């Protein structure tokens, strides 16, 4: 009754959908709504039934059968894989979007809704692969106007925001302001939060952890029930926590310097003592590996240790030139387009 009756109804509905999908190929159309709604409901229904392997494990090989049979012409075949991949995500796994992406029936035709669904999964894959640099760039940009990118649950906007926040924190990047009244104060807060996370807090690490573990598993939520789903969440949380902790330590080493990029040995040693309670040759050894691509080990007798980190690209005047090349091209491009709208 209440929650439980609705669960049975969803499980029934999904089983009937899989039966129809296996039988036919024209039981869906190329309307953006149907493919998105089916995916969201399927992901929700798998997650809800966890923890209770007896349902999900019976559902998944029948979802597989429907997946391996092609849809009708259009992106409908891709849509069936996107459902199957979504079911896999809720059942734990996040490395198989690579297999899905490479599939030879999804490079034949690509129409924008199925790209978005694939990209969502691929973004989780990139996070697991620790491709912080690539993920953050894509996520930082807003969604491109095509046909759709959400429809039925618009919590997808928050989902995208959450993933960008995690990728930026990992990669050594952040927002800048350009919006409303709120965004100044918000930006300042974000910067502070990142700094605190690196070097101290406790509470920031807790907040970061709670947001992050959320994305490894993917969301839509289970809908917490006392018994079963609790145990589910506990197992998941511990596994993710240990990994995120290890990543946090690497970030902290990569964030401290003697306010120079070509630090003297003594400055490095002081930074190592502040970072951890060990001698600063033991931790120098750990820093030269948990801070990537450093010439520091070779600087030996030299004492010119370097430890480096990324800096903003070509400088000062070049940044102005890049803007003005864009401006030149835009003036021409806009002129031609304005003429074209009245000449054809």
């Amino acid at each position: 009754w209440l929650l439980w009756d609705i669960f049975d109804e969803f499980l029934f509905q999904m089983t009937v959908v899989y039966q129809k999908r296996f039988t036919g190929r024209v039981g869906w159309s190329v309307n953006e709504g149907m493919q998105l709604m089916e995916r969201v409901v399927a992901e929700s229904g798998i997650e809800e039934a966890i923890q209770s392997e007896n349902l999900d494990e019976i559902t998944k090989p029948g979802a597989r059968h429907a997946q391996w049979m092609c849809g009708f012409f259009g992106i409908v075949t891709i849509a069936k894989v996107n459902v199957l991949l979504g079911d896999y995500m809720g059942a734990l796994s996040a490395l198989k979007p690579l297999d899905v992406y490479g599939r030879g029936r999804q490079i034949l035709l690509v129409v924008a809704p199925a790209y978005v669904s694939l990209l969502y999964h691929m973004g989780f894959s990139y996070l697991m692969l620790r491709r912080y640099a690539d993920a953050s760039r894509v996520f930082r940009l807003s969604l491109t106007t095509k046909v759709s990118s959400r429809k039925f649950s618009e919590k997808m906007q928050f989902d995208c925001a959450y993933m960008h926040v995690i990728s930026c924190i990992l990669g050594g990047m952040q927002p800048d302001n350009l919006s409303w009244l709120v965004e100044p104060r918000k930006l300042s807060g974000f910067e502070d939060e990142k700094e605190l996370l690196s070097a101290g807090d406790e509470e920031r690490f807790r907040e970061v952890f709670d947001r992050c573990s959320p994305k490894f598993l993917a969301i839509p939520p289970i809908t917490t029930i006392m018994y079963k789903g609790t145990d589910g969440k506990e197992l998941q949380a511990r596994l993710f926590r240990r990994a995120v902790k290890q990543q946090e330590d690497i970030i902290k080493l990569r964030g401290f310097f003697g306010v120079y990029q070509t630090t003297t040995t003594e400055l490095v040693k002081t930074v190592l003592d502040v970072d951890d309670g060990h001698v600063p040759l033991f931790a120098m050894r750990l820093r030269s590996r948990q801070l990537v691509h450093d010439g520091s080990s070779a600087d030996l007798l030299s004492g010119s240790y370097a430890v480096r980190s990324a800096i903003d690209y070509t400088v000062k005047g070049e940044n102005i030139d890049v803007v003005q090349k864009s401006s030149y091209r835009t003036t021409e491009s806009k002129y031609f387009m304005r003429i074209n709208n009245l000449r054809r």
């Binding site: 796994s93 490395l95 197992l235 596994l239 691509h293 080990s297 030996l300 070509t314």
Partner: protein, 201 residues
Amino acid sequence: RDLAKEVDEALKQDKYDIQLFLRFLKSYVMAGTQPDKRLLLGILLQTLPRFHSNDFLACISLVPGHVQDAPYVEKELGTIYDLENYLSCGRFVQFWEVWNQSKSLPAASPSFESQVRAGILIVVSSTLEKVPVAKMAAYLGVNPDQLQSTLTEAASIAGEAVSIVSCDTETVTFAKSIFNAPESDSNQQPLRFSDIVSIVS
């Protein structure tokens, strides 16, 4: 039944495939009455020659908290997990001081020691540019003499070549080098001017 033999062979003959292992782990996640200690330990002990890799993250996702907790299921998995973290974070010295060889799986892998060293060398080659011969040896537990006889090759990327320095600084191995990952033709001064004049005129 096939997958289990493939894990044993992956130790025993020094083979690896991520997708087979990922499937086996995906079977374990879905049905948690299937897992066997030795096979899972084998998967973990084959992630240790494969570092640096996201293989470890894939294992973390697909094996429940209870299973990777050592006293709950009474398996060596947590002990392995600690060793894995020590290898991955470059804490090679710590790994060596808690080293064992009395487990059945290391015995039933010939050349276990060399495979672990290969994993360490992969981590060094990716995240360091230039390493001293002695420093490199201290990561691997090996004598620097025997290390030289392995490292010296005519392709640096297959085995880091000597860059001998008489007196002064210690002899290093090349390995990667200045501006092999910093810069992408950014931050030298701009060559824009020639382009800028041409397109406005």
